[PDB]
Amino acid sequence: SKGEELFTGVVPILVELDGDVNGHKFSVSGEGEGDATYGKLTLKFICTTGKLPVPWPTLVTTFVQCFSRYPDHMKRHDFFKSAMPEGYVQERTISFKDDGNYKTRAEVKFEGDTLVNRIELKGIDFKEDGNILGHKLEYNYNSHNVYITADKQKNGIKANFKIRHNIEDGSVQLADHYQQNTPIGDGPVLLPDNHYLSIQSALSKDPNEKRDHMVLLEFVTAAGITH
Ligand SMILES: [Cl-]
């Protein structure tokens, strides 16, 4: 198909986010590349407004599921690539248990040969010295499964899933995710059977970088369908 063929090689990625969490306004710019053949992502993010006012891990899911590796026998279930190049809207509510919430609206699409993720993020209801605004989350990331379903009247997909962020005392901060994607363009898009994405994510720092930043290496395989 048109859209899948755009991903057979290494694709440059740009991420741009504007955020407001409890009145803390901030922006992040990221760059890197994806190789969907291997389900592989590398991205470096820099907070361009100074210190990021929330923990970096909390923004990982918001900062391009078109880079998931869909096995050949599952190609007919890959909504994300099918929407390309015109792209998709991706909306979420991320509910931090016993704390505030993020609501995100993003558009993921090509600009030339570069895959771009532009995001608006709004966070409200955060506790001033909860785990988020108090910066009590460890700089690491657990592996998760993302459960996707068709959303046919949207001509798209949905997902609800749980992210657990380790807290510095050894506990975990749950971040419930509810997600809806909608194609932007007029080409045919794939409405998948139920399946999941299996994700691992590793966070690191660039030893040479003194701006507030995050390096992310992530591998994603679609799974849960046999034929
Ligand atoms: Cl952090």
Numbering used by the authors: 2 to 64, 68 to 231
Quoted passage from the original study:
Green fluorescent protein (GFP), which was discovered in the jellyfish Aequorea victoria, is a light-emitting protein consisting of 238 amino acids. GFP absorbs UV–blue light and emits green light. The structure consists of an 11-stranded β-barrel plugged by a chromophore [Fig. 1(a)]. The chromophore is 4-(p-hydroxybenzylidene)imidazolin-5-one, which is formed from three intrinsic residues (Ser65, Tyr66 and Gly67) in the polypeptide chain by a post-translational cyclization, dehydration and oxidation.
